[PDB]
Design a protein around this motif. Structure first.
Motif: not given
Lengths: 68, 70, 70
Positions: C36, C38-40, C42-43, C45-46
């Motif tokens: 969660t 790592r996904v935070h 990534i989002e 950065q995107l």
């Protein structure tokens, strides 16, 4: 007698736990699937973060040359 | 119901101990599903963005071939 | 009270069975929290890379409108 009472609770509890073990095993495989998909995404972003950093420096150096 | 009574009260006693385990699990199942849809949305945004950069690098390679040999 | 010696024996069977379930869960809770974050990461950065590409595609759309005018 107390060995019966233990066997009873063990088997009563193991049958209650069959759904808990199934619920968990499906979470363990689904969590592993996500961790490999996230590993593949981070690698895919680590190879496209540099080209955008090269792109923004090319935008900064062309702004400095247009001022001349 | 003598030992059958015993087994039935033991079942609902063991169901009590499991209602935190079932609640811990239900919150993990919803949080794991939230992440899997967020990761599905990220992978399709990256599957849309990876080709255009591969097209961009080939355009950089074919431009380099025509430039130095002109 | 001999009912305490009974409970103490019974409770070891419950402990024996749920200790692995609690350990399986605690490892899932930490591993789910790791993804969660790592996904935070990534989002966000995107979310900083998605605008510059939408600025790039509109610059491509504006130059296509200017090339029509000649």
């Amino acid at each position: 007698d107390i060995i019966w009472d233990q066997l009873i609770v063990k088997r009563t509890l193991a049958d209650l736990l069959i759904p808990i073990n199934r619920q968990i095993s499906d979470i363990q495989s689904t969590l592993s699937e996500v961790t490999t998909r996230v590993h593949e995404i981070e690698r895919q972003l680590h190879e496209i973060t540099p080209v955008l950093k090269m792109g923004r420096t090319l935008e900064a150096i062309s702004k400095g040359m247009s001022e001349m």
